[PDB]
């Protein structure tokens, strides 16, 4: 048996390779981005935004974020999904974005995911898997984003209930807002200190 290749930080210039556009590099015709909603994508459009703060309470202006989620019916656009259901044919389920060099804000245009089956016939509350990479971070940090308007589902969520420190569970719940006619979930990540965001080893 072989050992997993060891992780290393994404580095300060991580944008060159994963978000060329943000680094003013036009080399690829098709660029991967933070927009998971296509023309015929099903579900309610939502905007996921926030910031990432270090131990001093300062936003990281060089962090890279990616998300992985199921479609509106809780089916993953992945061959590994064994639900036997047909997935939204116009949904990649993944996206990537970088914090703004000036303000530090990041965001994704996506769809609110449907409930996904849990282990042993349970049901997971709607959630988006999120990972962050950046200078100073030796291994990508895994976390989940739940929605505050799904209070009843969250209370019965297996993963949230596997966190024995009930106080920390709230750090995984994004807050709903409505700029105009658009739904926006605010999710700030705190890597260190008080209200430190929960990170998982998946």
């Amino acid at each position: 048996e072989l050992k997993e290749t060891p992780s290393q930080t994404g580095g300060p210039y991580v944008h060159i390779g994963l978000l060329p556009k943000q680094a003013n590099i036009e080399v690829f015709e098709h660029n991967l981005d933070n927009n998971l909603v296509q023309d015929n994508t099903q579900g309610q459009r939502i905007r996921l935004e926030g910031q990432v703060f270090d131990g001093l309470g300062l936003p990281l202006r060089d962090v890279l974020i990616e998300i992985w989620q199921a479609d509106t019916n809780g089916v993953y656009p992945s061959q590994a999904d064994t639900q036997g259901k047909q997935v939204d044919p116009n949904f990649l389920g993944w996206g990537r974005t970088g914090a703004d060099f000036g303000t530090g804000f990041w965001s994704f245009n996506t769809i609110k995911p449907g409930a996904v089956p849990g282990r042993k016939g349970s049901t997971q509350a709607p959630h988006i898997s999120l990972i962050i990479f950046a200078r100073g971070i030796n291994i990508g940090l895994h976390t989940r984003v739940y929605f505050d308007d799904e209070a009843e589902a969250n209370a019965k969520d297996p993963v949230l209930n596997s966190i024995e420190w009930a106080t920390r569970r709230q750090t995984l719940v994004a807050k709903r807002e409505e700029r105009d006619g658009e739904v926006v979930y605010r999710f700030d990540i705190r890597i260190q200190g008080e209200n430190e965001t929960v990170f998982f080893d998946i």
């Binding site: 992780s7 994404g10 994963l18 992945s78 993944w94 282990r119």
Partner: protein, 238 residues
């Protein structure tokens, strides 16, 4: 074959989150321990990227950004295999790489190193592994990069790489170095890795028989990702 969950990541084969020798990690590392969870469909699934979206020069860093001429530097080919810990090949995995140029200069706005920019070099590429988990790209060997950890810190020559494969749990980003580089033994970032055998797992080996005469040198570099266990009894994943 009915697949179960990915084998547990071995935390001792990876650098810890908090590593004082690597300064910027002091404020960007959680003080709380990671919460381990049992996997679900969310962790065992991952996106699929169609080959149709890839340009013909996406894996050729020597030419995908060349304008007036060729990039200045050492022509080198890098290839290898991507397997899971159980030796199974990883098919159609997305491999993205990026690096500095021959001067050790990154084409990034936040890089003000006096090393000279190369108008014909971009520094990024990507590709999908084939059915045997094989991958291959061409580039210019990057020069070491001076940085500010301790005032006179220098990263050995290195190429950044990222993989998105079959399971989200396999998501991995790392760096590989070139055999013989003396800076390897003094780098604080490479030293965050606990064992010597794991550090050597990040070194690309010179592959002399695969050099192309009067053209390019070649380095061999294999990547190992986490693997799934098969299930033969209860299947609680669902």
């Amino acid at each position: 074959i009915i697949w179960g969950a990915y084998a547990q990541r071995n935390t001792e084969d990876h650098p810890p989150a908090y590593a004082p020798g690597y300064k910027t990690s002091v404020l960007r590392s959680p003080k709380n321990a990671l919460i381990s969870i049992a996997e679900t469909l969310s962790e065992v699934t991952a996106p699929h990227f169609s080959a149709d979206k890839f340009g013909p020069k996406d894996n050729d860093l020597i030419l995908n950004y060349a304008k007036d001429g060729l990039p200045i530097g050492e022509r080198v080919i890098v290839h290898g295999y991507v397997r899971d810990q159980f030796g199974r090949p990883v098919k159609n995995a997305l491999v993205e790489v990026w690096q500095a140029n021959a001067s050790g200069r990154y084409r990034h706005p936040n890089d003000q190193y006096i090393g000279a920019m190369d108008p014909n070099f971009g520094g990024c590429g990507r590709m999908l592994t084939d059915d045997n988990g094989y991958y291959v790209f061409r580039t210019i060997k990057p020069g070491p990069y001076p940085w500010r950890n301790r005032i006179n810190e220098w990263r050995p020559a290195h190429i950044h790489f990222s993989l998105i494969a079959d399971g989200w749990a396999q998501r991995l980003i790392s760096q590989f170095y070139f055999e013989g580089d003396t800076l390897i033994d003094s780098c604080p970032i490479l030293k965050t890795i606990p064992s010597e055998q794991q550090r050597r797992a990040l070194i690309a080996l010179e592959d002399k028989s695969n050099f192309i005469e009067a053209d390019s040198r070649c380095y061999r570099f294999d990547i190992t990702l986490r693997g799934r266990r098969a299930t033969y009894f209860e299947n609680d994943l669902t």
